[model samples]
Target: DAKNIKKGPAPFYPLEDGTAGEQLHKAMKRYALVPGTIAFTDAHIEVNITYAEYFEMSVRLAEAMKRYGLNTNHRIVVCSENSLQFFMPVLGALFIGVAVAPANDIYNERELLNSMNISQPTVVFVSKKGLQKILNVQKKLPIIQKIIIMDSKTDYQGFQSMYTFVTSHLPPGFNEYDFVPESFDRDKTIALIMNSLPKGVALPHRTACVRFSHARDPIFGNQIIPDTAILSVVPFHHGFGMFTTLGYLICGFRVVLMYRFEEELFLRSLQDYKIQSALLVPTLFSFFAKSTLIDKYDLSNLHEIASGGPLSKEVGEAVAKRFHLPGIRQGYGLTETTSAILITPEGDDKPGAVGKVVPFFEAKVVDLDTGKTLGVNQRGELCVRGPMIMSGYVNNPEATNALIDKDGWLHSGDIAYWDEDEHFFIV
Candidate 1:
């Protein structure tokens, strides 16, 4: 290790042994074996699905995918907002080695074509609203062979609703015990999560799988509160949202998913679920710090954390004092880096410091104009190297090369500089 390169604390989990699908499937089975463990709460739809139900439905959906002849070579584009229906195809296709690319539901004709052209999805799961959008572009993207409706209650003549797709199909003797997860080369596969990035981030399965295991491990120098619940208000299409759908599932948390963020819904979910963790945006943090609504709801178990981005120090402290939290911990990561690679430990409230690097990763500052490495306290671009770094862009190989250099250092676009104590801060 070099002087400029900052390292992380001890790793809580190892690199995953299997593909993200297999690892996630194993976790589903773990909970399915129990009598009635509720895995997900679709607050919008007023539906709650137990692990046993999810396992049964997902396995059948996997069989349907296999019968449709979809495999690792094919992929699906999910153009729906956050919904329980969106979760099914994601996990079901993953079970059968079919890549899922969740795009924004509100994409116009132009944005829709630009995104669908990347991975060239074979099938598309769309919300009722997105059906016309996908249909308009279907001619251009002839690769999209099947269209599954996301919200319709039943299958119509032309479209198969997710309900019908999972319900009607059977290969004679259908049993959850006999269904096996299709395996793949974890390093070579893409579990695409279409992001705000133009080209989209093509993350490999292994990186996500390890993140799943790491979810259950210690975070912020403490063990996960048992029966912890997490509220995800972010769109599932983003990297942090991807964690909400994929990573958080393995951690045994009662995940409450929301399609959109409304003040009352958020407060009610916290009080109703006794939410222990949440992926809160700064707007919500500011609200929690000043809003009287927070006082009405018992957010006692809510563990406020800076999951990503520089927390405005004033707002963090105000919220910390308001919630009586030990310290407003912060985390730093990028879409290319998958998830958190740096975290502010508990009780460290230093301003502009985004905590130390996470384990199994290395971080350093580099000159903006020249690619030379910079010493501590010297401002420059941040570069990180680790397995979690994206494999590459789906279609933009040059962008991939530009972002990650020949030496495997992912040149983060963030203008970051670490302090003498190795705390990273964005300019």
Candidate 2:
């Protein structure tokens, strides 16, 4: 009973409205989230930001961006590494209603250019590593007007001055336009992106957003205690990180942002902050389970370990066995599903099964050729419908139409079978 005794930001989610974007806005405004909430960390020093500080930074950046003509529906490309700076700019951009499109940081020049060409960003956030590539192809990109650099001490050509703007002061030197505040639209495009361009499998932008957004609402019933610190390394550009970071922020929890996947440092920080919840991809867990250093640090502070992606069955069993704790459970999701479409209940985790359908969405499998919905134990394409679904891909009408029909049902291009026990297993 004491576990549920703690009170925190719990807003009434109006699912009937069918607007996930507005829903996000409601959560952000309702919760008094702290800035400098131990956001980024490395071997040297731990970076922290409270909600007050974070919000202030967001406001200033937002003002500066708008001064440069960014508004709701404007497509801006984000290509920063995972850090406090990276997260703030995104929230700031979204706060002002711009569609923040984050490209994979690891993308090469060709891949990067392809994404930029499609997104049509007026501004691109660049980490130090991406600077060279961006410079190389600068002339080719028509829409990009400015570059905001991060993670480096110095700036270069065509670069505006960068400063650590605080939340308290309204940033100066930016143009102000007296435009009416527009309502946030859930169906408005938030990101035009790809999770990963796996060699041969070019998963379309709309396809990924539709499925991922379909499952990306806060599972009100399954959420653990509020104000809990989430220890995670999900890359910000990736689909999984997009929802995890945003979802956690709206819930009013401090995110212990980790850049590198250093296991020892991860454990050290866990003990340092007493992190209560985390999202672990399979490979990361597999490494932790096999490392002899596992027992070297205190994991007592951990309460939940939600895993996702294509996890090996062997690794799944080892996570529960190695930790000897019920906190670990497999999360069934894809880049298309935001992050989690199915999560195992605390006490009822099925090793290989991704678990029951999440609350905000509905799932159905249909025979591809027959055009009939399949019954339990039958295999077919998995389709989902929910408010979490995105508006559409930016400027790609054909792809958008193919993925999300007029009725709003998103056909996830994957095969799965649901057993009689109500567990859905991806084929």
Candidate 3:
């Protein structure tokens, strides 16, 4: 029957009970003392923070936010590359119910202004190189009361270094702060305001938990190995980067972060960290397929690579052939889905398919002309309803209502179909 919709299996790792803050608290209690690590390395600098130390730092940041007057639901804007400095503020903000709006570091003046306007952030955090650009545009954004420079040891003008701002406000120890968890609706509270090109979408704490669960579940075929170590090169502003990095950490795995994407540095770090898995985009994966630069470094430790965004069949095949793996696992998602909605399972290498819908999510095909449901092997617009979908777009209810219908299904404006096995393929 045409109405036989497809539903993914029950989530292998079900959502835990509690608010987001409470969940982090539990994670810290369970794994805080472990030697699990989150490291960031560049050509010049290498830094590692143990899980215990990270918990302490995150707590300190939370206390600092309260001290600095960032209340619940306040927007904290961060514009920087991937680094310890960048991530600390995000963790800090998350702990206190302050939503984080991360703008792309590559944003030009106009793009930066547009994001700042949409986010209406209270504080803007920028890298050293991007500081001047913010200063030039800061006058237009009166809501941004403070500007903190990340990855810089010295403060610039009236701006403060991220280290100085965070450390100066710390109490004698992690436990001494008057840290009270804010009581807010986890489903209604916005966790991240992600920049989706020209617009920003709002994602709540529940969305993040769902994203993490789907990424770590064995049913997705990209489950984390015991003591798994991942090399993360995706941008922090993107959904794939935020969840995967923090998701792996909460699960007690090590994540080796790169400040930025550089071809040689990626290869060297892969060998040095003995990275087991990597999260990459299509452009980065192309380097592996097309470049001989990878031959100089030993990447035998690498077991799997998950590519998000747009991926092509030829590049996927070429990457698999170059790395001597079965295939390059591919997935499909938009910022609206919180990153991955469909991911190709390991060893289930359907060349052009982006795999089946993930657990806890339901999908179906609908005819564009007649608005009728389509059965297997029929092509039409794909619509999805799931826990991982975004709460809505920031400050744009009309646009939000236009995208998600009264039935709560998100109309994905792509032509796709599912076979009898329920595997989805984009045309």
Candidate 4:
């Protein structure tokens, strides 16, 4: 059966030269000449942005952040629905060495206020729908000095429209603007502060770069052609969304962004765009597996689907059979692990197992009763240590110290195990 497989891992990818910003710059330049596209669509409207245009827009916005007194170590909160506008400010802030803290767009007034209180962002970028919530909590957030709405209109006092701000602050042919390189300790410099369930986890530049390597590999170890078009429906605020987007874009994959998920529109896009792969959550995949509407569209072009979040064995198999694929590739990760700690290798389908540990990480199973390490097929807590693991939770030293042990191994609260073949499975 193994010999019948056509999909497998590629040679590991090494980190490109320079800081995160520089690496992005290199990718932009390389892909600028590549014939591919990145587009955002909502069934009614579509916006295409080339790598060159995206890079320039980010640079101008980075310059604007500087002009607005947002500097390294300062935080920016990006809370919005998925859109081209949502990504620009996030990329811009990170490019300029400003830490970005993204909150779920679905968060209510209390949740939004709680996250803002923790992040204490100097600048806030919110969608029109989310602006009022932020404003209601604005009084409690003394540190927020500026509010920028993602849409073209801004009626609230003291707030600026993202379009107007970025366009007005362009530093003369920003496409050719030479950025003053900023030095960063890749391992220590925080690149993102993302909400992890009930807490916030801080990911550094090194973790991001290391995780990028994992992202470059195929999920099921199946052969993946370069420039694969991945339909993007995951919310940009989630870890899955952010990492996958950055990874696909920088690796030369054309990413098609759907402003939001609608089953009919999503099914149509796959046929229209000839998408090769897609990353999805269990809820979305369930719809695809069971929906009769799927029979109405031509999904012959889709080669694989990678699912995250809660998925059942029955559902996973149903989807695989429906697509006539070997198996649905699924991965498991925590925000603290920087997205993926384990993913199924291409062509290797072990029911109930997430997958083998990814490259550049070490995993072990430890007994709960006596702290003894467990061997294959034994049950215990899963522990992981790697370059991709978060340095710590932001402003939560007690929580961080509790999670990562003195051995520098992050003790995942998950109950899991590995087999003789080194595949991981959750209990």
Candidate 5:
């Protein structure tokens, strides 16, 4: 007879295999470097960074972070324009199993200061362009111990350098990465303390668990490849952008980075990169539908185009018509879900709906007045459950317990409908 399998509640949730570090190593090896893999850079300067260069910088940054007193739980603030150096360094910290608290580079003075106070980054990373904004509040972020300056002029005396080498030129005798081992307690938190979360922020944990749970589902697993090349136009600040980075990086896929994309530039990147997958907002889709430049490129290589952020059905169809391609797919989530709680499968092809419930996400539509569960086609608050959710907001337990229910379901404040046809539509 076998010893009993050690089990807990939610018997089917898959066990996560490695610390965040090990996950990064495996993913970069598999995804970062193809002989021809190139990451587009529009940072301080326009250039392309090859895989070897990116890996080395990540390692160097990791070592630097360790010297700066970073432990697994330290929250690092990343504030910089879209640059290869800025994004990769934050990811390097994550590779070492530290949490990254990204504040949008464009946040105004007060907004930026508030974020810094909440995150309390052990260090801050800023591009030259961001120096003035950061300096404005440098004294207020009392916890900040170091600042790393990237491709810029105003010098902070204690800041670490963001250059591991230059992306514009290759260093001689460069070799690909060997895996680095990282350690994390399974109980350690994976994200940063969110301050000023919406008054009715949705539940984070159950929402997260359910989202990844769907990715591994037999039905959906084969639909989207872990390594599918994606041309991402969304800012890395959004949850959608974060998921794209995590999912693609962990699996070894190419992400053609962009800064302030133009329509013509978008078209060329798609064709030239032979991008198989992409995520765009609805307004961007409208641009693609109306623009004449879209028809000139060979977009045949595209396999999927996912749209979100206030998407509309009519907008989706118009985009599909322009390329004679199948229409776009949609999903729903806030930063609270860690990315997506529900995703439409690649070929599901729902013209008007957001598509099916993600596998493992237990959804509930409750009667507003009586607290009774509603049936299909009924409208109610859309609540979700799963493992891909956050542990909780740091130092904000009052808010944390408020959103995540005792039953482990995340209450998505957005009212939604689960239809008889198995599709979901937001009210």
Candidate 6:
């Protein structure tokens, strides 16, 4: 058990008051004080929002939400693609301490209905793609009170657009004034509920802060990088994409966000925006290495590329050489574990393995049959415990109990083994 346990950055961050939403609001406010810092760039239309503009807009939307009869207790859903339209409302809701779940727009009627039943949202900000789905299934659910279309500026079919609701209701001097959401437990309050299949993942206020701190800079106490440029191809609904994108606003990255992964556009974005870092899956790695289209665009600006899941050594070398990178980093975790349990270390020398245990995490490889902790290179199921782990599987305590043990170890259920170097590999 001695070698089994390891630690990450010490628990407390600078902003620790009220709920996670409050922490985020305060953190974003700090960055906005610096003038002319661009927060995001929509790659498609090339529209930009400065940090100051972002904060004030978030304030306006927060004010609008409060004025529109939503409060800290009510939950909201944002079912849309990866656009600034989807981003603003989520940030706005967080400001007033509402649990905002930016869910998948890809769901059909059955899937959307199932998620909304557990979520029970009072309001939904949906795009054109999902607008129809919500309308079709609206009668089946009893919780929905309003639906705001993200695309339209004018009220359509008796539904209000996001523009009309927030613009007219803005408080005077909203940018300069402070509006704190109602006080709630940082450790226990649900600020953001992330979505996946079967059940929703309930992440409390403290968990959001945990993700913000850990993801702000892979290693904390290291000087925070505030000006890095990044291309965001990942969707916003899932845990990996949602938290990372949320941190971008706080960290001050110039994000060239894409709605979908069309390779021609993805390559063009890297060259145009000078994206410095990316968290991509292995298939994209294959595209980087094997695609003839890579030769078409200039990819020199993209220096750091890490995998969201396990990446083979073979693909790593091909992509690394193609992109002129030394190595491609890999990390291991799930929606249940809140993204990453193991991440490839700083230098990226380790090959064919998912890095080491991340900060604020303790992981152990256990025997599959005997329930005993296993040694290095001995394959077993991975069990991890950490402050950042999800609160539970929403209301499904039966499944939550099955996943996380009484002592706090979350059984990852992946047959994994660690080498002498403490790097983990899964089958």
Q: Rank the candidates by lDDT, best first.
A: 3, 1, 6, 4, 5, 2
- Over the stretch 1-427, how does candidate 6's per-residue lDDT look in tens digits? 7776544435345434566677667777887888878777788888877778777777778889988778768899999988877777888887777788767788888888888888889998898768889987678886888888887779877777887777767666664346765567777667777766568888777777766766665443112565688787878887767877776766777767887778888788888777787667567787777777777788887777867777767888888777777887676878877677687777745667777787778888888888899887888898999877889988899989999999999998788888877777876
Scored by lDDT, model 5 comes in at 0.61
TM-score of each: 0.92, 0.80, 0.92, 0.91, 0.83, 0.93
| Residue runs of model 1 more than 4 Å from their true location after superposition | 167-169, 220-225, 286-290, 346-350
State, as a TM-score between 0 and 1, how close model 5 is to the true structure.
0.83
**lDDT score, candidate 6, position 71:** 79
How well does candidate 2 score on lDDT at residue 330? 56
Write down the TM-score for model 6: 0.93
User: What ranges in model 5 sit over 4 Å off?
Assistant: 1-16, 31-34, 39-46, 151-159, 164-179, 192-228
**What would the C-alpha RMSD of candidate 4 be, to one decimal place?**
4.1
lDDT of candidate 1 at residue 107, scale 0 to 100: 76
Model 3, range 71-132, lDDT digits (tens) per residue? 77489888988776667778778888899999988899889999889999988878888988
Better of 3 and 6 by lDDT: 3
Q: Across residues 299-350, which tens digit of lDDT does each residue of candidate 5 receive?
A: 8888778765446777778887886667666777666666565556557667
lDDT of 1 by residue, 41-136 (tens): 887776877778777777888888888788888889988888776677888888877888888777788888988888689889898878888999
Clashes of each: 0, 16, 0, 9, 10, 3
Those runs of model 6 whose alpha carbons end farther than 4 Å from true positions after fitting are 9-18, 168-176, 218-223
Go through the candidates in order and give each one's C-alpha lDDT: 0.77, 0.60, 0.78, 0.74, 0.61, 0.76
- What residue runs in model 2 are displaced by over 4 Å at the alpha carbon? 1-13, 16-44, 152-158, 161-182, 189-227, 401-408
Expressed as tens digits, the lDDT of each residue in 349-401 for candidate 4 is: 68867887777677887889886777778789888887778888878999999
Q: Which candidate achieves the best lDDT against the true structure?
A: 3
Scored against the true structure, residue 166 in model 6 reaches a CA lDDT of 78
